[PDB]
Each structure stands twice: as C-alpha cells, then as structure tokens.
Write a protein that binds this DNA or RNA. Structure first.
Length: 511
RNA sequence: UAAAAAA
C-alpha cells in the first residue's frame, strides 16, 4: 500500500472513436484533439475536416512562416562563427566569403522570427582540431587554439561551430566537451555542406535551438491547455520531470542517467542534470532523488519562492520487468529526497508533494493501421481519421491490446512523415494525484506538442525526448574524456563524467 | 552535427 505498481483506475473516454488494425486484430481507438499551439502573436489549433484535401497532414505538423517565437533575447546577441576544419586539406578558397554570405543570410532570416544576431565578427578558422593524439596524449593544435579563443571570448556571444565534415563524433564530442562542459559557453554546431545551402527552413530550425539555449520560448501550448498542468488548489504549475538511462557509453562502462525538469506554467524550458550510474548496464536510477535538488531550486526561482505541489515523473529507457523497481527505488528516492531538500529551500517546512510516475516504451512491435478515411467525431462530423497512410495523431488505444490490471495505454502522437508510425507505450506506474485515463492521456498527448526544436508533435512527451537528449550529450562528455581517463587509472564518477560548468546547469545546452 | 519521422 506504499510503492506498489499502480493498478488501472479506468479507461479513457474522449476523442473520435474509430477501429484500427493491429497485428493482433481489429481494436477500438480514440483520436484525441491536438492542443492549441501558441506562437508570439497567433495560435495554431488543428480542427477536424473531411479526408481528401490533406488537411489532416497539418495536425501536429506546422511551420514558423508568418509566426514569431514567444520569447527571444531583448538585446542583440553577437554570433561568432568558428569553422572547424576537420579534414587534412585547407578549405576551398571560396569558403571564406561563402561563410560570410551564409552568416548574413542566417541573421536576416532569423530576425523574422524575433532573434536579432550581430554577425559582424569575422569567422575564425581552426585547423587540426580533434581528440588528443596517441600512454601519453598531446592536445591537438586546434584544441589549443580554441581553448585560447574561449578564454578570450567577449560576453553576449553565441558560438556557431561550422563543421567542414559531418558525421565526425570524435570532433563533435570534443567540441561539446570543451564548450559545454569546460567553459559553459553557448554554442551550436552546423554541418557546412548543409548550412551553405542558405535555406530559410534550415536556418529557422537551427535558431529554434539557439533561442532555447538563450532561455527563449519558441512555441508553447495555449494558456487554456496549460491549465491541465496547473494545480488548481495552489495555482502552481506541476513540476514535470523526464528521466532516461543510457548504457555502455564505452565498452563495459557504467550507465548514464539524466533528469530534466520544467520550472513554470509554460513548460518551454527543461534544464536538467546527469550522473554516472553505479555499474554497467544498470537500468534503475538508484539515486535519482539526488538530482531533484536543482529541479526544486530552479522551479522555486520562477514561482516566487514556492515549491511545486505536484510532481509528474516521466521515466524512459526502462524494461517492463523493471517497473516494480522504478516505483520501489526511484519514486521512493524522489519522495525521500524532496522530503529532505524542500525544508532546506522553503524556510524549514515539511515538504511531501504527491507524485505521478509514467513510464514510456517507444520502441515496440505494435503497429496501428488505419481502416477508414473518415469517422464521425464528437461534433457529429465525418472527419479524417488517418494521415500520411497512418493512423491519425494522436490515436489512443487503451483497450484490447493493453493490460486490464495495469494502467497502460498507447498513443501515436506524431505524423508518420516516413514509414509506418510506431506508437508510444505508456504505463502509469504510480499516482498520488487521482489521475484518470483521460487526464493522463491528454497530458501525454499535449506534452508531445512542445518539443521546442521541432514544428511537429513528436512521438513521446517532450520531457522524455529532452531526457534522452541529455543522456546522449552526457555520453559525448564521457566519451571525449574516456581515452585519457583509461590511461591514468577505478576512476571516480566525477572524473569519468565531470559535471557541466555552473554557467549552463540551468540551460538546455543539450538541445 | 537543422528538424521531425522511419530504420
């Protein structure tokens, strides 16, 4: 009666009813409505129409043309290009002016979205940048030059690394290791053969990430939709968390866990922390609660000294047979850690916020095949229930192929732009918040529409995607230092996986 | 490492 895996409360009821085909036969589905997507001065709400004019392909699939980001830097930001020549030849003689041209087109392209960059600083060429060579290691000459550049970097400066060659993880890992972890300097990478095309769409996507790193907001959900994630009794936004674990960043190495968290009622920013797990292939985040301290601190700064009164914990990267341990270990770790941290932050008062835990499995064998083009929606209209040859986003299935006793459901929240879409499999593993299937399914689906670097609803709620990306970035850090850490060996966690510079601990540097 | 999607 404490820390047991939740049993099913109910089934969902909302949305357009239509049967779909799966590998285990025909099954009833419901299609949930999209939330209202919010831009600076306009919204996008998908509204049902009949199949036949491709209206349906716009659900969960918009673009920024004619729109502006909700929140951008109030002051012009300096944008410094650093060309990382990760080849053994000099770049072509045309590159210098081609890069100037691309930087100028970039700045004017993204001004239209509300981001004002100054790109007058001449681009800087760095040769011979790479991992330390050849135990003893000599720092690459490029890293020496870049290290000197970073210590001298003017303030209010965003770095654009322009990579001569893509698909170079050793160079990319080290760039992030130096720039994120050592210096905490804001930066994005761009593959030159892409950037040089001067595409407004490419530039618009690139700056989505920059704007987030600059603490901006691109799109969000409407105020009406965000009420779903606000505790009515306290009028305080729910603290939404995402965690992931990744395994074997190098062979036989300890796993890496991450925990990201929201901090206001817009859910546009998810800073996070990572840590090295205790052993290899370790799926349970034993000390996840230790990562809660910064989630609470950041939340508190944005809510006038208040701690959250509800916590929503999305857990990714987990096997079905580990669910019991997720609750008995990780949920317990969250409640016990905040029991300790809360009083340190709220002036010494008891702190025991109710937790809901939801586990996601996004790679599974289930596929949903549409049977009809139209079905009757809740207004009585005949309306598209498939898009791009796939079931409508977000088709929910919580009957037939799901557990009766356990609290699970599928949602296919995204457009299948290619291939056959894969639905996300969700489990509510723990819930102290009296959550119904309709409430949880709406939240899960809604949270797919605020992944801040895409103009689409993604296949898994944004906290999960964010946590996955932070684990991947933490793996970059582990890998960039691993060769040296092996040569001079066990090695402590903080040496294998040092914590990122305090400058960016509250920044979505991983996006 | 533009981005979602798919593998």
């Amino acid at each position: 009666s404490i820390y047991k895996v939740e049993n099913r409360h109910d089934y969902g009821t909302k949305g357009t009813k239509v049967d779909i085909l799966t590998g285990s036969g025909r099954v009833p589905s419901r299609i949930l409505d999209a939330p209202v997507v919010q831009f600076k001065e306009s919204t996008f709400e998908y509204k049902d129409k009949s199949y036949g004019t491709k209206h349906e392909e716009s659900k969960g699939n918009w673009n920024m043309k004619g729109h502006q980001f909700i929140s951008t830097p109030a002051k012009q930001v300096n944008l410094r290009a650093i060309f990382i020549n990760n080849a053994n030849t000099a770049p072509p003689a045309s590159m210098e002016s081609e890069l100037d041209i691309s930087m100028d087109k970039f700045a004017s392209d993204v001004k239209q979205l509300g981001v004002d960059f100054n790109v007058s600083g001449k681009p800087i060429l760095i040769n011979q940048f790479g991992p330390p060579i050849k135990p003893t290691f000599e720092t690459s000459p490029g890293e020496i030059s870049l290290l000197n550049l970073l210590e001298n970097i003017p303030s209010n400066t965003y770095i654009l690394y322009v990579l001569r060659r893509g698909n170079d993880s050793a160079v990319y890992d080290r760039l992030k290791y130096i720039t994120d972890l050592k210096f905490g300097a804001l930066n994005s990478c761009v593959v030159w053969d892409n950037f040089k095309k001067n595409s407004i769409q490419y530039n618009s996507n690139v700056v989505m990430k920059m704007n987030l790193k600059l603490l901006g907001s691109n799109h969000s959900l409407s105020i009406e939709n965000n009420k779903l994630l606000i505790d009515k009794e306290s009028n305080l936004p729910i603290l939404v968390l995402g965690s992931d674990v990744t395994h074997y960043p190098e062979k036989d190495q300890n796993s890496i866990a991450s925990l990201v968290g929201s901090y206001d009622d817009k859910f546009t920013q998810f800073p996070g922390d990572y840590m090295l797990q205790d052993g290899p292939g370790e799926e349970i985040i034993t000390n996840v609660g230790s990562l809660m301290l910064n989630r609470l601190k950041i939340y508190q700064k944005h809510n006038n000294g208040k701690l959250p009164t509800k916590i929503m914990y999305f857990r990714d990267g987990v096997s079905v047979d580990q669910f019991s341990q997720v609750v008995k270990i990780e949920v317990k770790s969250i409640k016990e850690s905040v029991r300790k941290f809360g009083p340190q932050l709220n002036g010494g008062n008891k702190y025991d916020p109710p937790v809901t835990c939801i586990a996601t499995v996004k790679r599974n064998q289930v596929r949903f095949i549409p049977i009809q083009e139209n079905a009757k929606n809740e207004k009585g209209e005949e309306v598209a229930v498939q898009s791009m040859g796939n079931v409508m986003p977000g088709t929910v299935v919580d009957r037939g192929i799901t557990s009766v006793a356990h609290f699970d459901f599928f949602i296919q929240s995204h457009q299948a732009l290619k291939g056959t879409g894969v639905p996300c499999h969700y489990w509510c593993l723990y819930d102290e918040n009296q959550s119904t299937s309709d409430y949880l399914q709406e939240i899960c689906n809604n949270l797919c529409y605020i992944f801040g670097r895409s103009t689409t609803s993604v296949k898994v709620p944004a906290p999960v995607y964010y946590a996955d990306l932070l684990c991947t970035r933490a793996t970059c850090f582990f890998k960039a230092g691993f060769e040296l850490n092996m040569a001079q060996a066990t090695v402590s966690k903080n040496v294998l996986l040092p914590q990122v510079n305090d400058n960016i601990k509250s920044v979505m540097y991983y996006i």
